[PDB]
């Protein structure tokens, strides 16, 4: 009644604080955005606070809101079920022939705004590769795969791909776990998919290092077949 | 001058010979099946010729026909394009907390029958885990991801999941390269997806160790989004 989805029936906002490093160099991001009900198509503005981000903004796409994915009736929406107590996320994305980003995320809801703090360590990145040299152009869509992971968690597996300036491709491997903070016995959804489409663009309003990003996310399932 | 999808406009059949080992134990499988036009929903019957298969049939699912996936107009069908010259597959499926299968596949078309030979090494498997103990029940659907891979290849990435006998899960990681065995310049499709749904049942006619398997496979794409609702770019 006033937990889970019931708390996502109106328009909402969110705010994010990221504390990071890449190959030793530190950085800080703050961001804010919003999601109109019925959700699933939303936007975020982000800025680097410490000056110029020392790596492509593109791999940050997934740090700058699973509870704003839209779920149809018939599939339990774990990330929305986690409230009001909140949730955490532990995530690794490993880039082929390049480095790995490991992040930890906390989410709290107050009123109609969800606040996140994230620490991320980006290590082993190649100084000459497209990430450190800012040569990533588009973000490919993903059909991310979701699985139940014990009584209090769900796991997300994905292939996250980026096109490059010379017309090629860089592949990332995402493995992510969402854990409910409370003791309450929420419904763990069974195996399903979440389709995620993303478009990041530089905001040349300010002379600050800042980007706008839009996301469409929608969960679905696939039927069995008989013999 | 007959090639690619032109060669797939009728009902077809296929035959597979698999030469495998799992943890040093050699085995042999032979399969056959058919696919009716317009393809995308098709069957196979397989049998272990060396007696009793020493592992679960479940992970053999993807060894026992990409060219029978159904593609919509607007997405080039790489596996069909590779004919008449033929198709090779190199593939690895690594299972979490368990072993890795490494396969080499070669496919050739004679008439309306696609013949294939596969070699597969299944190594590092756990003798007490659910593959070696035959405790896998269902095959989860996958939203496989396809990508261009140079001028003569495509790469498939997937997660292949199985349910177990006590109601849990076993996850596999699949990485597969399809290569065209010819020199003509064929179209390499852009990123897209192939949904695959699979159902395997033991066939309990006769004493021989065999299974029946049905697969539904369809390609789809996902569109781009513009920077806001109602714009363009």
What's the CA gap between B46 and A13, in Å, rounded?
Answer: 55
Q: Which of residues 113-172 of A touch B (CB under 8 A)?
A: 138, 140-143, 145, 147-148, 157, 159, 161, 169, 171
Question: Do the Cβ atoms of A145 and B148 come within 8 Å?
Answer: no
Token code pair at residue B215: 């697969």
Question: Do the Cβ atoms of B197 and A224 come within 8 Å?
Answer: yes
Chain A contact set for B212 (CB, 8 A): 227
Residues, chain A, total? 227
Whether B70 contacts B40, CB under 8 Å: yes
The experimental method, as deposited, was: X-ray
Among the partner-chain residues B143, B198, B226, the one whose CB lies closest to the CB of A143 is B143
- Do strands A12-22 and A113-123 pair parallel, antiparallel, or not at all (unpaired)? parallel
What's the CA gap between A163 and A172, in Å, rounded?
Answer: 11
Is B232 in CB contact (< 8 Å) with chain A? no
Indicate the DSSP class of residue B4: G
Distances (CA, A) of A191 to A59, A149, A181, A186, B5: 26, 10, 21, 16, 34
Whether A85 contacts A181, CB under 8 Å: yes
- CA distance to partner chain B, nearest, from residue A194 (Å): 10
- Do strands B12-22 and B113-123 pair parallel, antiparallel, or not at all (unpaired)? parallel
Question: Do the Cβ atoms of B191 and A223 come within 8 Å?
Answer: no
| Residues paired with residue B155 on neighbouring β-strands, in sequence order | B147, B177
Testing the interface with B: which of A147, A159, A166, A192 to mutate, by most B Cβ within 10 A? Answer: A159
Contacts of B136 (CB under 8 A, 6+ apart): B56, B58, B59, B130, B162, B163, B164, B165, B170
Chain A contact set for B159 (CB, 8 A): 145, 157
CB A116: neighbour CB atoms within 10 A? 21
**Resolution in A for the shown PDB structure?**
2.0
Among the partner-chain residues A148, A169, A198, the one whose CB lies closest to the CB of B147 is A169
| Residues paired with residue A107 on neighbouring β-strands, in sequence order | A87, A116
Which residue from B minimizes the CA distance to A142?
B145
What's the CA gap between A159 and A173, in Å, rounded?
Answer: 5
Among the partner-chain residues A145, A148, A212, the one whose CB lies closest to the CB of B143 is A145
B204 — alpha (psi -120 to 50), left (phi > 0) or beta? alpha
Tokens 């007490």 found at: B128
- CA distance to partner chain A, nearest, from residue B62 (Å): 16
Among the partner-chain residues B143, B225, B227, the one whose CB lies closest to the CB of A193 is B143
Q: What structural domains and CATH numbers belong to chain B?
A: 1-233 (2.40.155.10)
Which residue from A minimizes the CA distance to B226?
A199
Among the partner-chain residues B145, B148, B214, the one whose CB lies closest to the CB of A159 is B145
What's the CA gap between A73 and A85, in Å, rounded?
Answer: 23
Task: Looking at chain B, list the stretches that DSSP marks H as alpha helix, in order from N- to C-terminal side.
Answer: 78-81
Whether A112 contacts A15, CB under 8 Å: no
Contacts of B121 (CB under 8 A, 6+ apart): B20, B21, B101, B102, B103
Chain B contact set for A157 (CB, 8 A): 159, 171
Chain B contact set for A212 (CB, 8 A): 227
Q: Label residue A51 exposed, middle or buried (CB < 10 Å: 0-12, 13-18, 19+).
A: exposed
């Amino acid at each position: 009644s006033e937990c889970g989805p019931a708390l996502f029936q109106s328009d909402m906002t969110f705010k994010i604080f990221i504390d990071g490093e890449v190959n030793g160099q530190k950085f800080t991001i703050v961001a804010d955005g919003s999601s109109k009900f019925p959700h699933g198509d939303f936007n975020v503005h982000a800025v680097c606070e410490t000056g110029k981000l020392p790596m492509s903004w593109k791999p940050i796409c997934h740090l700058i809101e699973p509870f704003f994915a839209r779920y149809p009736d018939g599939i339990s929406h774990f990330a929305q079920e986690c409230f009001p107590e909140g949730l955490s996320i532990d995530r690794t994305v490993r880039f082929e022939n390049d480095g790995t980003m490991t992040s930890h995320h906390t989410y709290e809801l107050s009123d109609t705004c969800v606040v996140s703090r994230i620490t991320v360590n980006c290590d082993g990145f190649q100084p000459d590769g497209p990430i450190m040299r800012d040569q990533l152009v588009d973000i490919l869509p993903s059909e991310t795969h979701m699985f139940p992971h014990g009584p209090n968690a769900v796991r997300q597996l994905a292939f996250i791909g980026f096109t490059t300036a010379d017309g090629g491709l860089m592949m990332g491997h995402l493995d992510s776990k969402m854990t409910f903070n409370g003791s309450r016995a929420i419904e763990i959804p069974g195996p399903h998919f979440v389709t995620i489409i993303t478009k990041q663009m530089r905001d040349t309003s300010d002379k600050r290092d800042h980007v706008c990003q839009r996301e469409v996310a929608h969960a679905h399932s696939v039927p069995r077949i008989t013999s």
